[PDB]
C-alpha cells in the first residue's frame, strides 16, 4: 500500500503514525514518464514490507510540500525516520532504491 | 523578456513567430529552487541576444505540454529551430546551456 498524501497536515500525521519505521516518500507528477514506470514496483514493495511506510506526493497538488523539500529530478525518493531526513534519491533507479531501503530500515 | 507559453496552441504560435531563430524553452515549476536561481540569468540572456528566442512553460499549468515533451527534471531546457528539436538539457547548468546556444544559434 502506497498512501497518497493530501496536504501538509496529512503529511505530518503520516510521519507520526510511522512511529520508528523508515518512511519512503515518492514525489511524482502524473505527467512524468519515469514516475509512472516505477510506481507499480513501489506499490509491490510496499505490500511486502510491512516494516516500512510508503507515501507518495503529487507535486502538482502539493506544491507547498514540493517546495519544502527542494524537489528537482522526478521521481524523487525521500527517506525519513522519526521525522528526520536520512537520504535522497533522484530518478527511477530501483536497485539504488533497494540499497537505501536496506541501509536505512 | 521571457514569454510564458499559455497552452499548446500558443506554443505553436510562438514557434512560428521565432522564424529561423533558435528557440530555447525553459520547463520549470514555481516550487523549484534551481528554476528560480536561473530565471534571472535567462531574462538577461533574453534581453541581450536578439538572434535567440526564450520561452518558458510552467509544468503545473501546462501538464499536457510537459508530458508530450517527456520532462523529468526541473528545469529542463529544450532547443528548437524551425520546428525541429535539436537538443535538450536537464538541470540548471548555465555553461552547458550557453554552449548549446552558441552551437545552435
Author numbering:
A (entry chain B), B (entry chain A): 1 to 105
What does the paper say about this structure?
Litopenaeus vannamei thioredoxin (LvTrx) is a redox protein with a molecular weight of 12 kDa, which catalyzes the reduction of the disulfide bond in different biological systems. The determination of the crystal structures of LvTrx under different redox conditions discloses a dimeric form mediated by a disulfide bond and other residues that are involved in the dimeric interface. The LvTrx contains four cysteines; two of them are engaged to form a catalytic disulfide bond (Cys32 and Cys35); Cys62 is not involved in any interactions, but in human thioredoxin (hTrx), it has been reported that Cys62 is readily S-nitrosylated, giving a SNO modification; and Cys73, which in previous studies, showed a dimeric behavior in the crystal system of hTrx and LvTrx, mediated by the interface disulfide bond through the Cys73 residue of each monomer. In an attempt to determine if the interface disulfide bond is viable to be reduced or if it is a consequence of a crystalline arrangement, we used X-rays as a tool to conduct experiments of radiation damage to monitor the reduction of the interface disulfide bond in two crystals of LvTrx.
In the case of the crystal of LvTrx-3x, the structure analysis showed that the catalytic disulfide bond was disrupted at a dose of 32 MGy. Despite the fact that cysteine mediated the interface disulfide bond, this residue exhibits a double conformation in the seven datasets. The disulfide bond was stable up to a dose of 85 MGy, in which the reduction was complete. The tolerance that the interface disulfide bond has to radiation damage is unusual, because this disulfide bond is exposed to the solvent with an ASA of ~50 Å2. This result suggests that the maintenance of this covalent interaction could depend on the residues involved in the dimer interface of the LvTrx. This analysis shows that the catalytic disulfide bond deterioration is less tolerant to radiation damage than the disulfide bond located in the dimeric interface with a calculated absorbed dose of 32 MGy and 85 MGy, respectively. The disruption of the interface disulfide bond opens up the possibility that the dimeric form in LvTrx is also possible in solution.
